[PDB]
Amino acid sequence: MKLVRFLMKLSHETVTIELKNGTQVHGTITGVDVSMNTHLKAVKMTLKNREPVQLETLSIRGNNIRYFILPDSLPLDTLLVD
Amino acid sequence: KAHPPELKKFMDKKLSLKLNGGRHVQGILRGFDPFMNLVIDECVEMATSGQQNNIGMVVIRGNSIIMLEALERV
Amino acid sequence: IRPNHTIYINNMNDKIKKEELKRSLYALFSQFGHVVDIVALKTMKMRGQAFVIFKELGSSTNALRQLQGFPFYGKPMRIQYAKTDSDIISKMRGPNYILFLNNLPEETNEMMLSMLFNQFPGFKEVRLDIAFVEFENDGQAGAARDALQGFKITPSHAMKITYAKK
Amino acid sequence: VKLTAELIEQAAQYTNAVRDRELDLRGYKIPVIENLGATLDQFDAIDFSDNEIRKLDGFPLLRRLKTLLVNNNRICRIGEGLDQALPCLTELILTNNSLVELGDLDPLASLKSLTYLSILRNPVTNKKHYRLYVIYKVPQVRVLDFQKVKLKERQEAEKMFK
Amino acid sequence: GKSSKMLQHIDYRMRCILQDGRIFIGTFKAFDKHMNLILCDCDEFREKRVLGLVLLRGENLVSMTVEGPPP
Amino acid sequence: IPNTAHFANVTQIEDAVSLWAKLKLQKASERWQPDTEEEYEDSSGNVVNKKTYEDLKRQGLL
Amino acid sequence: REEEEFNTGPLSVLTQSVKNNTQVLINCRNNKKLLGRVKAFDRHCNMVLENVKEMWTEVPKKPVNKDRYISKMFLRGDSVIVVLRNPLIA
Amino acid sequence: MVQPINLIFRYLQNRSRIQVWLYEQVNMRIEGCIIGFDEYMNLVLDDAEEIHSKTKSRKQLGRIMLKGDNITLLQSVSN
Amino acid sequence: SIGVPIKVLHEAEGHIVTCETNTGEVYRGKLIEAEDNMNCQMSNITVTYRDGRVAQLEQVYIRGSKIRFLILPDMLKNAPMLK
RNA sequence: GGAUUUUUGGAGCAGGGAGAUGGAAUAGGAGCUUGCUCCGUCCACUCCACGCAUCGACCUGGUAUUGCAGUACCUCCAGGAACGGUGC
């Protein structure tokens, strides 16, 4: 029903987030709030026509995230049960 | 919540409003609204060449309101 | 004029930018001490003048004495003491051991003598046209005797500081 | 009292008068400037006044370093790898140093981003045609010893020793 | 749950990237529900622009990361 | 602030610091401080100037 | 109230994608069309899908088109512009 | 004080032709007679026409349901 | 119900501040009225935009919808803003 | 708790025209290397419509102000226009 409870239970997983400006940040999801505030640690960000930069921490808002990319070994069938 | 904007001092005063896309209008305000909607009676809009065109009483919504400058001392 | 932490320089070139002149004044004042603030305006009232407020009053006095009449961007700037206290300094604020003083003004209170002796570090006590100032340190008392020998305080008379005898 | 990581981590850092992040490292008497990797290029200005540094070298790669205060020191030689470690170095205050010859200003020509240089109160400034040699060797510098470089001084520097 | 993601970076220097491509590096002091950041003595890089205490709205924020140690 | 019978049944910080300021002022007042409390008449004029403290006398006799 | 509006309104067109396990296409604002099976949906059109294929066209900055495949992805309802259901799984 | 909702109700009762400008689009506007309104400023124009100021053309569509999120300015015309 | 940056903006009313809009317009002057929805009404204001068209107006009013940032002095960053 | 001031976005895309103009060291295809010919990607100069007008920052020369303050920015004249954004 609510996607925020499913996104909050995806902690300690290496995922990727593509923004609306073409910047893709790949990192381990460590913190998710009700407003989809993605706080990741040891992330790598690649902007549009720029070099990738590695950061120890990153905080991306929910309104600035356009798409997400999860690994194929993620238990989406078990995490969907509330 | 839902507090109205402080537009009591700018009532019945000739002010110039800016709208999105680079639009400029000038007119006297005739009321207020909690959704930042302004009614400008006998409004005149500035064209691209510089000529002013009188459009009469118009209604400007708050979604495209950029800046309103009062041309009269309040 | 009493010495303070803020030194005001005037008669400078007003044709340069404000930020470039402020950076040049900061680079000039960094050689004498830590510059806490730099007030520089370019209006019609404050044209061609600026000021630097430092942490210590001795560094500001050394910058006012050393850079007196120094050429700055083609024009020799004149440095002097500030008339009032700075706002940042007011916000942040709120041989022998005994030295003999002669020809002291009688109208000066103990607070003015404490503010004059505050250039040296903390002393033991003060005694009040003759006065006796005893410091807790020997080197601080020697520096206070070498600094107050002919100081510029109450310029109608001349103050003389000498070391006490046994 | 050498410059280490514990001395840089315990040093005060704040905003200067030009709204830049400056760390106050004065009053340390460091004989050699080293171990600057603990700052991680988080400071825009370096306040190393009143020290005992002999050579301005040994600095790591810091792209955010734009101002260097080396006043009241004994700097007599400049490192040749200053451009590879500070590409954005624009302010260099070397007043009251131990520079005696103009040949120490030859590694200073590699800093293309340097615009403000101070070489006052030095025996190298008392030599003949020192300002013309500094203008000819470093054309990127616009302000030398709190003086704006004019076109006549550039023409006099380009005429002699061409 | 704990909501300690914004409280751990309090009183620290962080660099926030804007939507138009600007970067504001300042000391984050407080926040709100609308992600209103108050950066005291902040610098604007894209060139250096002296700004100082800049109160940027949360609608123009994209990403934020740690810049260095607290002053 | 030392632990004495004066600071008993006092549980708040600012109350303790204010009562400490009060007790300090009281005791420091009621002692005999010879440095500022004393009347010396130096032999500079030897028949005048009895307003000399205990420090100005050393400065004049140095 | 909410379940009847979700099973009788436009969201039922999403609910036919997860119940019958059909393939639908989503055209986004970045000129990209992702065809896949909708696995999880919500009221804010948060679509978590599996085995998606995204196709678009790019310029060198003549241009050329391109496509790629993802095992499992999740897209918010803000960037979803067009959603088309077509019998393409058969 | 004249309310904008009361002005919209008076314009709907008078059945006069009004022109609506779009948000971030100065080249094309709409023109028609507003019949009814709602809380979300949804206009129902009968025999509406899209006027393009760049090409100087007018294309009629008929009954149009214009949303209030796109209409930035609305003025009254005599035509 | 009231945020701490909203309270800092309401407490800074009457000082020489500036508000930079999303289009680049910087309205500078004394903040006369500051509501909870970032509505800044200033008197004797000055327009210095990213376009650079610097002018002086008697009164200006910028809403919080197109407001990008606000540059305030550092007189209120010490107390009671220390938390 | 997706319907105007914040978080389910009004965002995406392209830089005017011409000239027997010039270049792809290692990176286009076809006429199945090399030489030549043709066509859907830039920068430099020239011409029409220095794309246009505006203000801010900035450089040269002349010129005025000698003034104690907590600042969007600060004298004026003329030339050049490397930069920013606004409307067409």
UniProtKB/Swiss-Prot annotation, chain A:
Its main location: cytoplasm. Keywords: Cytoplasm, Isopeptide bond, Methylation, mRNA processing, mRNA splicing, Nucleus, Repeat, Ribonucleoprotein, Spliceosome, Ubl conjugation. It is found in: Cytoplasm, Cytosol; Nucleus. GO terms for cellular component: catalytic step 2 spliceosome; commitment complex; cytosol; methylosome; nucleoplasm; nucleus; pICln-Sm protein complex; precatalytic spliceosome. Residues 1-80 are annotated as: Sufficient for interaction with CLNS1A. GO terms for molecular function: RNA binding; U1 snRNP binding. GO terms for biological process: 7-methylguanosine cap hypermethylation; mRNA splicing, via spliceosome; RNA splicing; spliceosomal complex assembly; spliceosomal snRNP assembly; U2-type prespliceosome assembly. Residues 2-74 form the Sm domain. Methylated on arginine residues by PRMT5 and PRMT7; probable asymmetric dimethylation which is required for assembly and biogenesis of snRNPs. Belongs to the snRNP core protein family. Plays a role in pre-mRNA splicing as a core component of the spliceosomal U1, U2, U4 and U5 small nuclear ribonucleoproteins (snRNPs), the building blocks of the spliceosome. Component of both the pre-catalytic spliceosome B complex and activated spliceosome C complexes. As a component of the minor spliceosome, involved in the splicing of U12-type introns in pre-mRNAs. May act as a charged protein scaffold to promote snRNP assembly or strengthen snRNP-snRNP interactions through non-specific electrostatic contacts with RNA. The gene is SNRPD1.
Swiss-Prot record, chain C:
Identified in the spliceosome B complex. Identified in the spliceosome C complex. Present in a spliceosome complex assembled in vitro, and composed of SNRPB2, HPRP8BP and CRNKL1. Contributes to the binding of stem loop IV of U2 snRNA with SNRPP1. It comes from the Eukaryota. Keywords: Acetylation, Isopeptide bond, mRNA processing, mRNA splicing, Nucleus, Phosphoprotein, Repeat, Ribonucleoprotein, RNA-binding, Spliceosome, Ubl conjugation. GO terms for molecular function: U1 snRNA binding. The keyword Ubl conjugation applies. The modification Phosphotyrosine is found at Y97. GO terms for cellular component: catalytic step 2 spliceosome; cytoplasmic ribonucleoprotein granule; fibrillar center; nuclear speck; nucleoplasm; nucleus; spliceosomal complex; U1 snRNP. This is U2 small nuclear ribonucleoprotein B''. Belongs to the RRM U1 A/B'' family. Residues 5-84, 97-166 form the RRM domain. It is found in: Nucleus. Gene3D superfamilies: 3.30.70.330. The lineage of its organism: Eukaryota, Metazoa, Chordata, Craniata, Vertebrata. It holds the Pfam family RRM_1. Patients with systemic lupus erythematosus produce antibodies which interact with snRNP proteins. GO terms for biological process: mRNA splicing, via spliceosome; U2-type prespliceosome assembly. It comes from Homo sapiens (Human). InterPro entries: Nucleotide-bd_a/b_plait_sf, RBD_domain_sf, RRM_dom, U2B''_RRM1, U2B''_RRM2. Involved in pre-mRNA splicing as component of the spliceosome. Associated with sn-RNP U2, where it contributes to the binding of stem loop IV of U2 snRNA. Its main location: nucleus.
UniProtKB/Swiss-Prot annotation, chain D:
GO terms for biological process: mRNA splicing, via spliceosome; RNA splicing; spermatogenesis; U2-type prespliceosome assembly. The keyword Nucleus applies. The keyword Acetylation applies. Changing Q147R: Results in defective spliceosome assembly. One of its GO terms (cellular component) is small nuclear ribonucleoprotein complex. Keywords: Acetylation, Isopeptide bond, Leucine-rich repeat, mRNA processing, mRNA splicing, Nucleus, Phosphoprotein, Repeat, Ribonucleoprotein, RNA-binding, Spliceosome, Ubl conjugation. Residues 122-160 form the LRRCT domain. Belongs to the U2 small nuclear ribonucleoprotein A family. Involved in pre-mRNA splicing as component of the spliceosome. Associated with sn-RNP U2, where it contributes to the binding of stem loop IV of U2 snRNA. This is U2 small nuclear ribonucleoprotein A'.
UniProtKB/Swiss-Prot annotation, chain E:
It is found in: Cytoplasm, Cytosol; Nucleus. Residues 1-70 form the Sm domain. It comes from the Eukaryota. Methylated by PRMT5. It is linked to Cerebrocostomandibular syndrome: A syndrome characterized by severe micrognathia, rib defects ranging from a few dorsal rib segments to complete absence of ossification, and intellectual disability. Core component of the spliceosomal U1, U2, U4 and U5 small nuclear ribonucleoproteins (snRNPs), the building blocks of the spliceosome. Most spliceosomal snRNPs contain a common set of Sm proteins, SNRPB, SNRPD1, SNRPD2, SNRPD3, SNRPE, SNRPF and SNRPG that assemble in a heptameric protein ring on the Sm site of the small nuclear RNA to form the core snRNP. Component of the U1 snRNP. The U1 snRNP is composed of the U1 snRNA and the 7 core Sm proteins SNRPB, SNRPD1, SNRPD2, SNRPD3, SNRPE, SNRPF and SNRPG, and at least three U1 snRNP-specific proteins SNRNP70/U1-70K, SNRPA/U1-A and SNRPC/U1-C. Patients with the autoimmune disease systemic lupus erythematosus (SLE) have autoantibodies directed against some of the individual snRNP polypeptides. The most common autoantigen is called Sm. B/b' bear Sm epitopes. Belongs to the snRNP SmB/SmN family. This is Small nuclear ribonucleoprotein-associated proteins B and B'. The chain holds residues 4 to 87 of 240 of the full protein.
